[PDB]
Design an enzyme around this catalytic site. Structure first.
Site, mmCIF file in Angstrom:
data_model
loop_
_atom_site.group_PDB
_atom_site.id
_atom_site.type_symbol
_atom_site.label_atom_id
_atom_site.label_comp_id
_atom_site.label_asym_id
_atom_site.label_seq_id
_atom_site.Cartn_x
_atom_site.Cartn_y
_atom_site.Cartn_z
ATOM 1 N N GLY A 79 2.929 6.394 10.464
ATOM 2 C CA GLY A 79 4.142 6.151 10.119
ATOM 3 C C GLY A 79 5.229 4.845 10.405
ATOM 4 O O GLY A 79 6.184 4.427 9.915
ATOM 5 N N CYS A 92 3.673 1.846 9.884
ATOM 6 C CA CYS A 92 3.588 0.745 8.707
ATOM 7 C C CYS A 92 5.051 0.311 8.307
ATOM 8 O O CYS A 92 5.798 1.055 7.813
ATOM 9 C CB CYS A 92 2.905 1.339 7.720
ATOM 10 S SG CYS A 92 1.055 1.709 8.130
ATOM 11 N N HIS A 111 0.725 -1.228 -0.070
ATOM 12 C CA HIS A 111 -0.042 0.011 0.024
ATOM 13 C C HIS A 111 0.847 1.225 0.009
ATOM 14 O O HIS A 111 0.260 2.217 0.033
ATOM 15 C CB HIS A 111 -1.036 -0.170 1.085
ATOM 16 C CG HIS A 111 -0.329 0.244 2.437
ATOM 17 N ND1 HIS A 111 -0.107 1.268 3.024
ATOM 18 C CD2 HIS A 111 -0.198 -0.808 3.406
ATOM 19 C CE1 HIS A 111 0.196 1.202 4.486
ATOM 20 N NE2 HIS A 111 0.336 -0.267 4.658
#
Ligand code: RVR
Ligand code: CL
Lengths: 305, 305
Positions: free
Chosen positions: B143, B145, B41
């Site tokens: 942030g 991820c 993503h």
């Protein structure tokens, strides 16, 4: 979202852990530049621990009596000196993995990460706080002596603790990196016990402000309190006295949530009185005291939910 | 003595964390050899999250559309491919700090350490367990991820988790290092929720054995129980069924303490029915389920890496 007891990444400290051997004793050391720091009781036998004369035991030692092992390599010792309860071993190689560091002495209530080691080898990392009685509730087995406590703010490792002993109640005592013990402890096998432990009030309040930020408000109330009246109640529950310094330190969290410090003190006063009644705050059934106001700002978001 | 939730030393993983940017999105990546692994993503905008055709978004990208930053150095991307929900970025430089590693898929109940990162920079480490409902109760902000979960076995790092998203209840969902999700989750802005959770019974029993080792025996009783009768009681308190495999795995802790597994099940049965009655076990008012039987052994033996 989420609230976890979080330790600092241990990597900068892992590259400093060495194994120190003196005769039959084997503990851990911290290798910074060309010096290895370890507890001075490494020169002690089990008979020596009752009443040790460290100056008399150290004068009988030479550099080659201390074996220092960094990984699979032997470091040659070229000097030795004592500073309070820590032994400083001058080695022939400067540690190439030495990070930016400082030695800091912490006060009760301050938190830190502990890298627990055995035979100069790190086995785990955990977060804990310096208790008001100067002990730490850590997880230490035989051979963990010389494991260090630290904070990493920015690119700097701040060394604040070196593990020295376990008390009869299972709690732990040790020194700052200059060999000065925290609390009234000695590196001697004597009848010493931890004082009565008190809850770190400023840390419980910080954790209640973290709960409000994560959307938990069930414990708040329409009441306020004077600082003096709060302390008269809190001390009945073995809580540490809350000073004006603590109120000032909680200022940013009070502003971010819109709940005055003395208003949060009234919620804590009521929480002590009523208990949780089957409820939890941030997934806990007890009131948490090992998160400082600085830790709450570090971990929690700037936006309140 | 002492019992703490303990994470593995994060050092071998810290040297693999990089920052991945694609247009306006910035998350973390794991740099192993000449490949950087990150959530797919990263190629998505906020409009794209609703129904993202990842093959169609990836075909429109070139190598220079991905900016990879390792510390203060820019890594040049020379290839890109997808494996399930993870993006594999071929880089020009092999990571000199690549440790001995394996990609492993864990089962619910197994625990791991999480190195939480923001902008390719590690900020904290904590231990957690894969819940029976496949979510993790972690601590993540925007942030985070691409933060990874891991265990260490000797010198080998076993990567088992990569963070992808947060659920509306504040819990977290992510994939194994091959991009396969843990749970019925999808990588997109849609109506998804964590299922009803259960208590990891074999882990609570392991933590009760750890309490006995640390001198806590108030919960022990003269009674025993059948595996079937225990499971009928466990089914009522949202506890995972206890299998014969679980009983076998608890064997060494049963031998070390001298308390048979079904004897400890009678103690847990009594804690589930009558409660703790103002008491704590290992400083906790709740029954802890994030320590596996192996974790109890490793912490009460001193296993180093
Ligand atoms: O406390 C001590 N060791 C130690 C340190 N960390 C963890 C653990 C232990 C012992 C086993 C349990 C876990 C020693 C020996 N025992 S002692 O009482 O002789 C002692 C006294 C002072 C000093 Cl500085 C040291 C000591
Ligand atoms: Cl301090």
């Amino acid at each position: 979202s989420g609230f976890r007891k979080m330790a600092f990444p241990s990597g900068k400290v892992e590259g400093c852990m060495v194994q120190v051997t003196c005769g039959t004793t084997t503990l851990n050391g911290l290798w910074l530049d060309d010096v290895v720091y370890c507890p001075r009781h490494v020169i002690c036998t089990s008979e020596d621990m009752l009443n040790p004369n460290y100056e008399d035991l150290l004068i009988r030692k030479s550099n080659h009596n201390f074996l220092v092992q960094a990984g699979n390599v032997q470091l040659r010792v070229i000097g030795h000196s004592m500073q309070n309860c820590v032994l400083k071993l001058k080695v022939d190689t400067a540690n190439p993995k030495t990070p930016k560091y400082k030695f800091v002495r912490i006060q009760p209530g301050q938190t830190f990460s502990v890298l627990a080691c055995y035979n100069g080898s790190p086995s785990g990392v955990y977060q804990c706080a310096m208790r008001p009685n100067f002990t730490i509730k850590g997880s230490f087995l035989n051979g963990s002596c010389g494991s260090v406590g630290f904070n990493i703010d920015y690119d700097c490792v701040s060394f604040c603790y070196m593990h020295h002993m376990e008390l009869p109640t299972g709690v732990h005592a040790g020194t700052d990196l200059e060999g000065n013990f925290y609390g009234p402890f000695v590196d001697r096998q004597t009848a010493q016990a931890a004082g009565t432990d008190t809850t770190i009030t400023v840390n419980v309040l910080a954790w209640l402000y973290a709960a409000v930020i994560n959307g938990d408000r069930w414990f708040l109330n329409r009441f306020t309190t004077t600082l003096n009246d709060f302390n008269l109640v809190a001390m009945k529950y073995n809580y540490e006295p809350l000073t004006q310094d603590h109120v000032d330190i909680l200022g940013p969290l009070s502003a971010q949530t819109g709940i005055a410090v003395l208003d949060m003190c009234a919620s804590l006063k009521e929480l002590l009185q009523n208990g949780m009644n089957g409820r939890t705050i941030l997934g806990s059934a007890l009131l948490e005291d090992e998160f400082t106001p600085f830790d709450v700002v570090r971990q929690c978001s700037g936006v309140t939910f």
